[PDB]
Amino acid sequence: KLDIKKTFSNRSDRVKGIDFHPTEPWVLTTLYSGRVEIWNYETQVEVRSIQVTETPVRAGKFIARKNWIIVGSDDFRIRVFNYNTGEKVVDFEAHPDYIRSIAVHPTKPYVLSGSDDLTVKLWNWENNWALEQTFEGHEHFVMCVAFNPKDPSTFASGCLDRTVKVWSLGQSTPNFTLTTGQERGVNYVDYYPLPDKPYMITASDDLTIKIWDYQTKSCVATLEGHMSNVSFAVFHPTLPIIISGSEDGTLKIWNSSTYKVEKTLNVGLERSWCIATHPTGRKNYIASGFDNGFTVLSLG
């Protein structure tokens, strides 16, 4: 089943953010150098690239329904570009500190940004990118934000304060706070996308990945094996696997039922920072960004 092939890999400066376009065979990379690139990974030709800033751009997503990309950087700013024309649609200071993570609501015109300023902010692009809410309560850098795809009126924030908080849009306190026991903090949080399990997953500098039942708050499993900071861990949308990546230079694929490692890949680009899975499992594509570039893999 698992038959991993390299679709396209290219070298670049450190890739901190990465995302797939849902209908074009494109991947967006956002770099530590302030540059962002959109690649057609089937033709292996650049669609568009932009020197956005001189600071790191840690976060970037497509907003395909608007033909946009949205990026956030260490200069504190969110910028949005039309990927067909190159037009800079908006450019604003979002936080008084680094932006770590951006999430886009699946149907409503909302973007979340998580920041070193200890907050998550909600922006509405149908209201001139107005700040509609600030979510306060975390006590260290907010490293990752993610909507619950099964109920995107709620979202999770993962924080170096060692917690995940789950929030409701329009409400000022978390529905709950998970104490992860990941004492070096949480770098990443993700939701299992299918209706049969209320699961989330967290990755930490403490070398662990943990699976959580968000209804009971129980830790279902702890996945050990990475040898340095775990940058991310995600559930694949269609295959029964979890995919993680680490500053140890490896991607790991784990069985999502037994939680045992199935495959370890060192693709030779040094530290791994970010991950994307194709929205619809097209060719079972995944992509990861590293110190020295990115790779797009077909898993089977």
């Binding site: 450190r14 680094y98 490293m143 530290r271």
Partner: peptide
């Protein structure tokens, strides 16, 4: 600044 990388 922690997590500068």
């Amino acid at each position: 600044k922690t997590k500068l990388l």
